[PDB]
Amino acid sequence: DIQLTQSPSSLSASVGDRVTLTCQASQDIRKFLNWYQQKPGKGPKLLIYDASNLQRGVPSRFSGGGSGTDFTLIISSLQPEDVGTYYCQQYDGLPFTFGGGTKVVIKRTVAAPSVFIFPPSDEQLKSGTASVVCLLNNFYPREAKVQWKVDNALQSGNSQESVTEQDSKDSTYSLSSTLTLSKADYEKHKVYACEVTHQGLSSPVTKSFNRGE
Amino acid sequence: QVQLQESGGGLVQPGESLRLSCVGSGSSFGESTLSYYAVSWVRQAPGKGLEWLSIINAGGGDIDYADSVEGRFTISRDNSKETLYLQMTNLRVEDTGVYYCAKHMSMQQVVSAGWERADLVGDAFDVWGQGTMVTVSSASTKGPSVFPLAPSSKSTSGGTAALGCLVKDYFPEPVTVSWNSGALTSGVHTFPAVLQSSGLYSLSSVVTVPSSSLGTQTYICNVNHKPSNTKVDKRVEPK
Amino acid sequence: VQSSSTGKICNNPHRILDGIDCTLIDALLGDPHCDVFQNETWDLFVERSKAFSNCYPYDVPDYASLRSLVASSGTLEFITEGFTWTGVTQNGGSNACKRGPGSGFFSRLNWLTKSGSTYPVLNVTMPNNDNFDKLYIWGVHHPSTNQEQTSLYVQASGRVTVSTRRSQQTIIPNIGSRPWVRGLSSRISIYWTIVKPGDVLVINSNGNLIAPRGYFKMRTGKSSIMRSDAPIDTCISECITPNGSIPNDKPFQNVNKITYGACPKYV
Ligand SMILES: *[C@@H]1O[C@H](CO)[C@@H](O)[C@H](O)[C@H]1NC(C)=O
Ligand SMILES: [Zn+2]
Ligand SMILES: [Zn+2]
Ligand SMILES: [Zn+2]
């Protein structure tokens, strides 16, 4: 099997930067190499076929080069809509193989999240479980710390975070943290608090509520 | 251009079988349809890259398989229906993922002229389907409970209010969420599902709407979880 | 007057080649079930009524002339030449002409089609620097539909022009249906060109060319061809008719007006 190794594994860059992705083959594959782009939740799309040919309809800022074992995909001026994963793929010989992919990420100005908290609904408690949700909206960079506090006691091991893919239009992220505990435990305590720390905030932001208010 | 659409995906136990289908429509140069082309199956495990599985030539010959599925999977096609099939048997947990069918660009046969390329080119995949999700698990399907995430007074941050739907405890993937039947899309975020310790998925969808809207307008979230034939429309209102 | 025959063609002294299921033209082009006849020679080629074609359906304008001149040449010696066909796909084949289990084509012809999204104007030359005549066999594909035409050749109308320094033939393909034969309503037409020593072949096409792979060496001599269903026996006779061999001790004969060798005169 011919192995394709892509670098870097992951890259952050600013709008307008000239970006270079590399694909290395373990053996001479001549020019039988194609590059694809895949956006989150979508199927791949051909960008470059046979090492250097730009597919019909693909923007001209994309170009391809190389031969033998060494190939490059170049984006002359990175756009926010370019976020996603790029794969190289080889068809010199069966089995056909793909590179492990390179993920592209946009850098933009800092933007502080707006924070909201939601208590468990009445329908859900009626069924023995309590979910408390914290939402961080439209922020950058992705790194954020979300800390749960129950009756002012620092919580751990009972929450899960999920993060959206970087937005194709404004390059921000959104995040949700869900604190899950049994109805019994939820009814024990009174004050529920989500405390958020982030580079765009001068100091930690806290959102809270009192159970049954 | 030719377009592809896979179907047949679903949840199955390890050891069981499953047949995926892929239907071609549209047409390319010279009104060529899918039966003029070689086609491959390619899959993508959750969070992973792409793995080529199998190729078949326009006329049904020159078949090959990756070692990882050779002897278990069988590729075939019915050109009268412009349809491709992948018959999977003896499925295992690590076969879980999204399966795509994908057309190779070089013309391989023209039936009306009795012509066939001497060689199988197998060049670039110029058209891909949307993919079909396959889950191989011992666990049984379970449909989601849908709960409102209700906006409250003092919840304002920026100049906006937030509300949402919590879609909890379902298996397998995936569930779709829209708002007001797709009429509301600005400011919608649907988060990736997270696997809970229970082995079931949970997901949230939220939307930010001007604070003035709350009592005045209506906000409804529509959740689909085809695997259990679940279709819920839950109304989100202030507490 | 010799009025009788044994009913058998004697295999001596003349070299008889029994065509069995093949006509001479099918042997020339390289119909797969006929490739046994590759590079063969004969004094007399014998065509059987049971012969049949089993490759891409074709016709030969002036069939009678090509058949006659090859039969007279008495050999199928073929010499491959290194034609270069830049920017097209070679070795097209068909399930109308299987060679073993897969699709195939006449062995002596080369079905060219587009490469990628184009079929350029082909323009190739092959000089004759030998001291014998070369016979080139080439062809033209006539598609049954416009969809077919463009799928194969890109150009909406093709053209094949083959010339030497003093002759030229230009053929324009004709799109449309002919009667269905072995599943196919399209056709190939076969043409030929002789190139003398010091002359040169030029082939210029922007579609529908079925290219030659090389040439047949032309000879002159006593060779010919005959239609007959008589079996071929081990025995000796100078005179051969389609009815069988006949003695040539008598000055006249009444067996058949078609004869080969030292034969009495037909009356
Ligand atoms: C075809 O090739 C010949 C020989 O090289 C040359 O004389 C002639 O100019 C060429 N014709 C075209 C159309 O290029
Ligand atoms: Zn292997
Ligand atoms: Zn407490
Ligand atoms: Zn938002």
Domain boundaries, chain C: 1-14+231-267, 15-230
Tokens for A142, please give them.
């992705």
Tell how far CA A194 is from the center of its chain: 23
Structural fold of domain C1-14+231-267: Hemagglutinin; Chain A, domain 2 (2.10.77)
What CA–CA distance (Å, rounded) separates A132 from A13?
Answer: 35
Query: What is the residue type of B5?
Result: Q
Tokens for B165, please give them.
């739907």
What CA–CA distance (Å, rounded) separates B1 from B129?
Answer: 13
H helix or E strand, kind and range, residue A209: strand A205-210
Whether B129 and B211 share a structural domain: no
Partner-chain contact B52 A124, CB within 8 Å: no
Whether B109 and B158 share a structural domain: no
What CA–CA distance (Å, rounded) separates B35 from B42?
Answer: 18
Domain boundary among B138, B170, B190: B138
Angle at Cα A130 formed by Cα A128 and Cα A132, nearest 5°? 170
**Cβ-Cβ contacts under 8 Å, A131 against chain B:** 147, 166, 168
Is the distance from CB of C93 to CB of C103 less than 8 angstroms? Answer: yes
Partner-chain contact B30 C95, CB within 8 Å: no
**Cβ-Cβ contacts under 8 Å, B113 against chain C:** 141, 143-144, 148, 151-152, 184, 186
Which domain covers residue B144, as residue numbers? 139-239
Domain boundary among B73, B104, B138: B138
3-state secondary structure of B62: coil
Partner-chain contact B30 C93, CB within 8 Å: no
Whether B132 and B145 share a structural domain: no
What are the CA-CA distances from residue C140 to residues C78, C97, C172, C175, C221 (Å)? 21, 17, 8, 12, 31
B23 touches chain A (CB under 8 A): no
Closest ligand to Cα C84: 1
C119 touches chain B (CB under 8 A): no
Resolution of this entry in Å?
2.9
Angle at Cα A142 formed by Cα A138 and Cα A143, nearest 5°? 125
Whether B126 and B170 share a structural domain: no
Query: What's the structural domain count of chain B?
Result: 2
Whether B87 and B133 share a structural domain: yes
| CB half-sphere exposure, B227, CA atoms < 13 A | 21
Name the closest residue on chain B to residue A114, using Cα atoms: B157
- Tokens 């278990």 sit on residue: B72
Name the closest residue on chain A to residue B204, using Cα atoms: A176
Tokens for B66, please give them.
């990756």
Q: What is the CATH number of the domain that holds B171?
A: 2.60.40.10
Which domains, and CATH codes, for chain A?
1-107 (2.60.40.10), 108-211 (2.60.40.10)
Which residues 6+ apart lie within 8 Å of A71 measured at CB? A22, A23, A24, A25, A33, A51, A64, A65, A88
**Minimal CA–CA distance to C85: which of C136, C135, C138, C123?**
C123
Query: What is the residue type of A187?
Result: E
**Minimal CA–CA distance to C141: which of C183, C102, C93, C101?**
C93
Whether B144 and B65 share a structural domain: no
CB-count exposure of residue C196 (10 Å: 0-12, 13-18, 19+) = middle
Is the distance from CB of C134 to CB of C162 less than 8 angstroms? Answer: no
Domain boundary among B89, B116, B138: B138
Q: CB atoms < 10 A from the CB of B164, how many?
A: 29
Provide the sign of the torsion angle of the four alpha carbons C164, C165, C171, C172, taken in this order: positive
Q: How many Cβ pairs within 8 Å bridge chains B and C?
A: 59
Partner-chain contact B67 A95, CB within 8 Å: yes
Q: β-pairing, C214-217 with C134-142?
A: antiparallel
Q: What is the 3-state composition of chain B as percent helix, strand, coil, each rounded to the nearest 5? A: 10, 50, 40
What CA–CA distance (Å, rounded) separates A60 from A81?
Answer: 14
Q: Report chain breaks in chain C, C–N > 2.5 Å, as residues after which they occur.
A: none
Alpha helix locations (H) across chain A? Answer: 122-125, 183-188
**Minimal CA–CA distance to A134: which of A197, A203, A41?**
A197
What CA–CA distance (Å, rounded) separates B127 from B27?
Answer: 11
Whether B103 and B58 share a structural domain: yes
Whether B132 and B45 share a structural domain: yes
B2 touches chain C (CB under 8 A): no
Tokens for B21, please give them.
């289908």
**Minimal CA–CA distance to A91: which of A29, A25, A3, A5?**
A29
Question: In this structure, which residue's CA is closest to atom 4 in ligand 1?
Answer: C125
Is the distance from CB of C218 to CB of C72 less than 8 angstroms? Answer: no
Whether B235 and B196 share a structural domain: yes
Dihedrals φ, ψ of B236, to 5°? -105, 120
What are the CA-CA distances from residue B92 to residues B11, B16, B69, B70, C230 (Å)? 12, 9, 10, 13, 68
Rounded to the nearest angstrom, the distance between the alpha carbon of C171 and the centre of ligand 1 is 19
Is the distance from CB of B154 to CB of B183 less than 8 angstroms? Answer: no
What CA–CA distance (Å, rounded) separates B40 from B17?
Answer: 20
3-state secondary structure of C189: strand
* Multiple choice CATH, C15-230, 3.40.50.720, 3.20.20.140, 3.90.209.20, 1.10.3720.10: 3.90.209.20
CA distance B195 to chain A (A): 9
Residues 97-136 on B with a CB inside 8 Å of C are 106-107, 110, 112-118
